[PDB]
Write a protein that binds this ligand. Structure first.
Ligand SMILES: [Zn+2]
Ligand SMILES: [Zn+2]
Ligand SMILES: [Zn+2]
Ligand SMILES: [Zn+2]
Lengths: 46, 48, 67, 1114, 216
């Protein structure tokens, strides 16, 4: 979705509160990436 | 040669030991957290 | 990764024929050299990349997010 | 389809490698360790008992790793790859079972953790072990990573196979002067101890053992060794007649001039000269004073109870030195592998273990004393959970070792370092390149050229194709493709067996030996000197190849030296190959259909008596042929394939047998730097500096060695259609010239991946370092210096980040190191923001960021940055064949030849390189390439073999291309026929590290080091370069004064010192300060290194007083 | 900190572009310092006792697998604890015990004073004594509030079962939450209601575990 970031194994949309926990709400599995930014970005193919 | 700028063979043996400057023996960067690393001469003579 | 979209010399588009290549090999079992030829690449530098180029992208898609 | 007896042996090497793996060295020794040597070490010390409370004991019983007796594999552990992201240390816990003494009727037990062991990926106990392509997915990890490397602290490291000189063995060295030292250094368990022996002077020869004071005449010791007959010494160590008679008796003299009769006093001469027992225990000052040493001096090789063995052992050793004093040569260098025994991680980690575990016990005692000192009630107390608190010294200490490489062994008092490494992943080849690398160590000083060169005995048991320049304090080699490093086997059974064959015990022996047969040496220890040596041999070898005591326990006869050796030692190199009984082999060619069916495989031929493992000794005694095509029924064995000799790295090179070897050496020193696809888990893992390529391709000509390392499923390189011509004039030495509109079409494009770890840590003030950010002044937009973040303050995915921006915002607390008090109300919140800035010559992109928690529960943030480098001018390329070069002008498209098809040679390469480097292998590889792409078949090539060139022609000539690789071309510039033929086809050019955009460097005036105040070193920190005394002299020859004064004076440290003419010394501003003046000081300039040299000196007591004079007017 | 010798502006910026690293003002552009010099690369009764207390302290620390971090905070409490000579005539254990316990409370972590004690002979009382005693001397009040939400975690891991417990966790806590508003929560060893709610949701998750193995 549009919210902040993702688990590793759960691969689930996860929004986190400021200083809440490093866990993922669903799985007990810890590490979490940061999902893609919705903001535009420019490349020049050449 | 003694026209006594030095004043004879008695200074050869230590009496007053010359402490070197700080810029010769710089305390290592204070770094994050209290202990900055010593820098040799700062420990030897400070033990002497 | 993916078959390039042109060779590194000619500039004929190879991006297309990789699908039609492999399909043409598995179904209709037929030898390499004859295959690529009637697939339409006579020049050999155009040809290598079909022949060469292991396709990794499959072996890279085992690791996707969702599983 | 009858399989050809010629090549069908090929099907061996895979089946060999298929079940028993490529990298099994690091596995087996490990899997042997955890499954066995633990059950030994504790069986050594199973009882710790204080001196107090005579009723107590602590009795270990079993050791287990990960298995508490619930399931076979541990019910839960942490997956290794995911364990690599958190900076954790991949671990399986230790389990021990104990017996106590606590209170009346206990003697109870449990299953307890003493700590955690860093096991090894794809060992027995690993989660990855025996998991096929599915768990691989769910565990998010590579299928093709060979494993065998540890992982600790999140970094990724390897124990490197460590060569060591033969231990517990004879060696005899001669020298100018000297007198031919002999040495035997024996070790097992306790007390690794050397014993030298040599002549001191002029036929008068002595034992030096540092346990003794100085020396003893060998006649004395040998008497005291319990052979008392004297003159029969001569009959023993000397021989019958030859020359040897005189040379030894000269020695035997000086025993007569002194003392005799070991019955009491001849021993007493020794203990008389031994050092003290250090007070207590001296009680043994006796005639049995030294009777201890005569069985344990150095040699723990024999010891025992009566003396005759060690006696005659030291004797037979004394023979070989007087044999050397007769004539030089006829001795033992330390070079050929049989005199050197490498050793794996198996014995290493135990030796380290039993130390750490030993300290664990010694100190856990002293902790069990504190409780039992001062009586409280009746002191019982579990006296058991105290292992938890007093542990880790086993674990954290172990991690310290395995990661750092400092091994401090208190028990041997022997320290070694540089023993592990970061496993360098620049390629799939390097993955197993660091893996299987022999690190030689010691080597005394460098100045001896002996332990350097490549000995012909090395054939096929070590890679001949790399000995790179990282030599320094050591040497680096690699194994072959087929080697099985023999483990420890056993002794007593092979001993009693040897008797069973009818060898006669030394005690029965004539005490005249050397004349009769040879003698039979177990591990370099004399036993029987049996009758009929050769028949004994053939009998024994016949047993090994079928019935009993297999693999190692090699055997070889000997002639000049009269001996037959049975060696049981572990840690030794062996190799496979086929026995030929009578004329032909034992294969019989129907056995291989019986093989490739899959119901047969390998390690089944031993039980069928076909192939077995020789040894450098054994094979030296044996006789081998290359091809089945040539046999004579004088033979023994034939190699299964010749190209097993080139290493896993070396097997890459196509047609190596056409080169000159230094090219293959530089190639084994390159290909591991070829950028590549790494592993399938590539994008998911986050590494420190990881290159990788956009469009990798199979090298057009493979080698039967490549396919078996799966190198074509992770190819590193581009396959470039490449003329050979002089073009431009930007070419010259090795410098390539690339092709625009080609390089732009996706040729040779690179990516690069960096990680920036920022650990967040809480401070004792209870204040957390915070990532908050995004200032955003002036109406809804962040400052450009900021930008690239997003609301979170952390960096964000996929956005272009440019030079001086901030890809992670970080701020420390200001008071963090203050003294925490129970006093606060409002502000803990003052922060010093010290964000890490991006700095680099190019832009880049943030692809992926990781927020996680470390093992100890402290916040962790890791981002990784990427950029795809276009292969800019100045980028090292290789031909994989030894050509090492940099691109020149990048021409456009239109330029350079084309010919009839229209194709444009992509790389174009200077001809000159081939003749002077004299490498025709490549120049065949080109043919094989063009022939390949026509038939549409990958066409092979390999060391001593490969596609026969003369048919390659036939494949081309009908399809229109010249019977040899040459063809016409049209110079792009003019457009008229090139006046000479040109030669081109596909070649595989791999692109290397040393991308230029890294390596270019410049400085205007940068930072200076505090101490010398002259510019700092190298790339990274900041600029500045070296003028060495080797170089500095140069400008003197030209005679330039002003260039130096600009150079080592103005431009580096320009400095004004204020000195005092009277009594010359320095001083600041106005004062001389030794003489308070503020008058006689004169301002002048001088290199700050020179002042620093004064204040250095004058600190030490010495006084560079400066007498001065004015420049002008005399 | 300093001011431009000309523009008299206070805003200074160190330009990292060209590998000078000069410090300059955004005002007139004059440099403050070029050439950015950087660095690189006894007998006391108190040293003995103190560093001995980092020894004994760090000992009991990783036994409980607490953060090594917190040890330094606790230790310095011990430092301040020695300042009042409160630490002199008592059992060294009970002293450093509370000295660590007060720390791990100040961080709101899961270690319960009962668990902390059983390393010893001790009655979970003598420790209860010393702790509550240093509450007086060193003046501290507000910080140490123990709560259920923490104990269930460290429990939950040791409870075996399976990944379901996470749900159970999410289950149990909301349970324990209402019990606090159910106004039965005060006047109780928080471990009691902890294992209680755990057993509750576990039964609610239809998994059968004994009463013993819980209180384990
Ligand atoms: Zn999750
Ligand atoms: Zn083409
Ligand atoms: Zn002066
Ligand atoms: Zn200014």
């Amino acid at each position: 979705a549009t919210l902040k970031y993702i688990c590793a194994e759960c691969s689930s949309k996860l929004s986190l509160s400021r200083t809440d926990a490093v866990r993922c709400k669903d799985c007990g599995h810890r590490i979490l990436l940061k999902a893609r930014t919705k903001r535009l970005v420019q490349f020049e193919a050449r | 040669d003694a026209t006594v700028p030095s004043g004879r063979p008695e200074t050869y043996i230590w009496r007053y030991l010359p402490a070197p400057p700080v810029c010769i023996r710089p305390s290592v960067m204070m770094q994050d957290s209290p202990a900055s690393n010593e820098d040799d001469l700062t420990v030897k003579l400070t033990e002497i | 990764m993916i078959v390039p979209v042109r060779c590194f010399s000619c500039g004929k588009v190879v991006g297309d024929k990789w699908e039609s290549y492999l399909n043409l090999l598995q179904e209709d079992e037929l030898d390499e050299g004859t295959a690529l030829s009637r697939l339409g690449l006579k020049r050999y530098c155009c040809r290598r990349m079909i022949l060469t180029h292991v396709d990794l992208i499959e072996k890279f898609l085992r690791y996707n997010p969702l599983e | 389809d009858e399989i050809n007896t010629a090549q069908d042996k090929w099907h061996l090497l895979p089946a060999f490698l298929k079940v028993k793996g490529l990298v099994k060295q690091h596995l087996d020794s490990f899997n042997y360790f955890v499954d066995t040597d633990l059950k030994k070490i504790i069986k050594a010390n199973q009882l710790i008992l204080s001196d107090v409370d005579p009723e107590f004991y602590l009795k270990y019983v079993d050791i287990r790793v990960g298995k508490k007796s619930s399931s076979s594999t541990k019910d839960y552990l942490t997956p290794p790859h995911e364990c690599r992201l958190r900076d954790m240390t991949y671990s399986a816990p230790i389990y021990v079972d104990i017996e106590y003494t606590r209170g009346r009727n206990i003697i109870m037990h449990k299953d307890v953790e003493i700590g955690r062991m860093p096991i090894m990926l794809r060992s027995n106990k690993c989660i990855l072990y025996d998991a096929d392509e599915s768990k691989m997915a769910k565990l998010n990890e590579c299928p093709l990573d060979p494993g065998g490397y540890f992982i600790v602290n999140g970094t990724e490291k390897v124990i490197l196979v460590q060569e060591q000189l033969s231990k517990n063995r004879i060696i005899v060295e001669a020298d100018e002067k000297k007198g031919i030292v002999q040495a035997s250094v024996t070790s097992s368990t306790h007390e690794r101890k050397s014993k030298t022996y040599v002549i001191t002077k002029n036929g008068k020869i002595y034992l030096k053992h540092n346990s003794i004071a100085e020396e003893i005449p060998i006649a004395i010791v040998l008497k005291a060794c319990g052979i008392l007959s004297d003159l029969e010494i001569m009959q023993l160590v000397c021989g019958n007649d030859s020359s040897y008679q005189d040379i030894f008796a000269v020695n035997l003299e000086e025993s007569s001039k002194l003392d005799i009769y070991t019955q009491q006093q001849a021993l007493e001469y020794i203990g008389a000269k031994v050092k003290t027992m250090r007070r207590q225990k001296l009680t043994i000052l006796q005639e049995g004073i030294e009777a201890i040493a005569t069985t344990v001096i150095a040699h723990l090789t024999v010891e025992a109870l009566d003396f005759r063995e060690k006696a005659l052992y030291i004797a037979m050793m004394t023979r070989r030195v007087v044999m050397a004093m007769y004539n030089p040569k006829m001795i033992d260098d330390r070079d050929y592998v049989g005199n050197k025994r490498l050793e794996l991680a198996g014995q290493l980690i135990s030796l380290l273990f039993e130390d750490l575990f030993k300290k664990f016990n010694n100190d856990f005692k002293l902790s069990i004393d504190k409780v039992l000192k001062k009586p409280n009630r009746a002191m019982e107390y579990d006296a058991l959970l105290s292992i938890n608190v007093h542990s880790n010294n086993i674990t954290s200490g172990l991690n310290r070792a395995i990661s750092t490489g400092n091994w401090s062994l208190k028990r041997f008092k022997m320290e070694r370092a540089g023993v592990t490494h970061v496993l360098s992943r620049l390629s799939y080849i390097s993955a197993l390149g660091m893996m299987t690398r022999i690190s030689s160590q010691f080597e005394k000083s460098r100045k001896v050229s002996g332990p350097r060169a490549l000995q012909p005995s090395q054939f096929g048991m070590l890679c001949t194709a790399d000995t790179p320049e990282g030599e320094a304090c050591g040497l680096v080699k690699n194994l072959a493709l087929m080697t099985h490093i023999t483990t420890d086997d056993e002794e007593e059974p092979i001993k009693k067996l040897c008797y069973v064959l009818g060898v006669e015990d030394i005690t029965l022996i004539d005490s005249a030996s050397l004349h009769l047969n040879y003698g039979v040496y177990l591990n370099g220890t004399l036993i029987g000197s049996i009758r009929f040596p050769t028949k004994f041999v053939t009998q024994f070898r016949h047993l090994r190849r079928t019935g009993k005591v297999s693999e190692f326990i090699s055997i070889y006869s000997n002639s000049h030296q009269m001996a037959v050796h049975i060696a049981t030692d572990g840690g030794r190199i062996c190799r496979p190959l086929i026995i030929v009984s009578d004329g032909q082999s034992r294969v019989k060619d129907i056995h291989l259909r019986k093989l490739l069916d899959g119901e047969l495989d390998f390690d089944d031929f031993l039980k069928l008596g076909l192939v077995e493992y020789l040894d450098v000794n054994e094979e030296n005694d044996s006789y081998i042929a290359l091809y089945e095509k040539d046999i004579v029924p004088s033979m023994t064995h034939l190699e299964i394939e010749p190209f097993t000799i080139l290493g896993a790295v070396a097997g890459l090179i196509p047609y190596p047998h056409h080169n000159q070897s230094p090219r293959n050496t530089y190639q084994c020193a390159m290909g591991k730097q070829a950028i590549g696809a790494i592993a399938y888990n590539q994008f998911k893992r986050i590494d420190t500096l990881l290159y990788l390529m956009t469009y990798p391709q199979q090298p057009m000509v493979k080698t039967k060695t490549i396919e078996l390392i799966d190198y074509d499923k992770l190819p590193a390189g581009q396959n470039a259609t490449v003329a050979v011509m002089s073009y431009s004039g930007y070419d010259i030495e090795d410098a390539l010239v690339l092709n625009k509109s080609s390089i732009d079409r996706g040729f040779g494009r690179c990516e690069t991946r960096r990680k920036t770890t920022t650990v967040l840590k809480r401070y004792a003030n209870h204040t957390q370092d915070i990532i908050g950010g995004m200032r955003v002044d002036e109406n809804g937009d962040p400052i450009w210096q900021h930008q690239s973040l997003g609301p979170d303050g952390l960096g964000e995915v996929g956005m272009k980040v440019q030079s001086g921006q901030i890809y992670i915002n970080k701020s420390v607390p200001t008071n963090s190191a203050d003294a925490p008090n129970p006093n606060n109300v409002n502000v803990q919140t003052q922060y010093r923001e010290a964000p890490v800035i991006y700095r680099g010559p190019e832009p880049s992109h943030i692809d992926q960021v990781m927020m996680s928690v470390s093992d100890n529960d402290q916040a962790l943030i890791k981002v990784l940055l990427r950029q795809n480098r276009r292969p800019e001018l100045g980028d090292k390329f290789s031909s994989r064949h030894g050509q090492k070069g940099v691109c020149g002008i990048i021409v456009k498209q239109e330029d350079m030849p084309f010919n009839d098809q229209g194709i444009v040679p992509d790389i174009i390469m200077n001809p000159h390189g081939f003749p002077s480097r004299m490498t025709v292998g490549k120049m065949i590889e080109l043919i094989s390439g063009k022939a390949g792409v026509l038939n549409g078949t990958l066409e092979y090539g390999t060391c001593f073999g490969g596609s026969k060139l003369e048919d390659m022609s036939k494949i081309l000539v009908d399809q229109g291309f010249n019977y040899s690789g040459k063809d016409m071309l049209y110079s792009g510039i003019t457009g008229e026929c090139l006046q000479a033929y040109i030669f081109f086809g596909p070649i595989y050019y791999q692109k290397l590290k040393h991308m230029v955009l890294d390596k270019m460097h410049a400085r205007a005036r940068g930072p200076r080091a505090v101490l010398t105040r002259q510019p700092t070193e190298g790339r990274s920190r900041d600029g500045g370069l070296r003028l060495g005394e080797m170089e500095r002299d140069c400008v003197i020859a030209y005679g330039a004064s002003q260039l130096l004064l600009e150079r080592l004076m103005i431009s580096s440290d320009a400095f004004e010192v204020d000195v005092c003419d009277k009594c010359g010394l320095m001083g600041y501003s106005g004062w001389c300060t030794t003489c308070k003046s503020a008058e006689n000081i004169i301002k002048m300039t001088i290199p700050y290194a020179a002042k620093l040299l004064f204040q250095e000196l004058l600190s030490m007591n010495i006084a560079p007083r400066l007498r001065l004079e004015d420049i002008f007017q005399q | 900190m300093p001011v431009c010798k000309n523009c008299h502006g206070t805003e200074f910026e160190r330009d990292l572009s060209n590998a000078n690293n000069d410090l300059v003002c955004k005002a007139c552009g004059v440099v403050s310092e070029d050439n950015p010099i950087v660095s690189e690369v006894a007998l006391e009764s108190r040293e003995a006792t103190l560093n001995n207390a980092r020894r004994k302290l760090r000992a009991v620390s990783y036994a409980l697998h607490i953060p090594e971090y917190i040890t330094d905070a606790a230790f310095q409490w011990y430092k301040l604890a020695l300042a009042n000579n409160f630490v002199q005539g008592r059992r060294s254990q009970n002293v450093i015990a509370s000295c660590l316990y007060v720390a791990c409370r100040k961080e709101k972590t899961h270690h319960m004073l009962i668990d902390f004690s059983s390393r010893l002979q001790v009655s979970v009382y003598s420790i209860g004594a010393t702790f509550l005693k240093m509450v007086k001397k060193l003046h501290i009040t507000e910080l140490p509030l123990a709560d259920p939400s923490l104990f269930i975690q460290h429990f939950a891991e040791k409870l075996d079962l399976a990944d379901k417990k996470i749900k159970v966790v999410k289950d149990a806590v909301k349970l324990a939450q209402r019990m606090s508003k159910d106004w039965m929560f005060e006047g109780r060893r928080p471990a009691g209601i902890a294992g209680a709610c755990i057993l509750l949701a576990c039964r609610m998750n239809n998994l059968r575990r004994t009463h013993t193995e819980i209180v384990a």
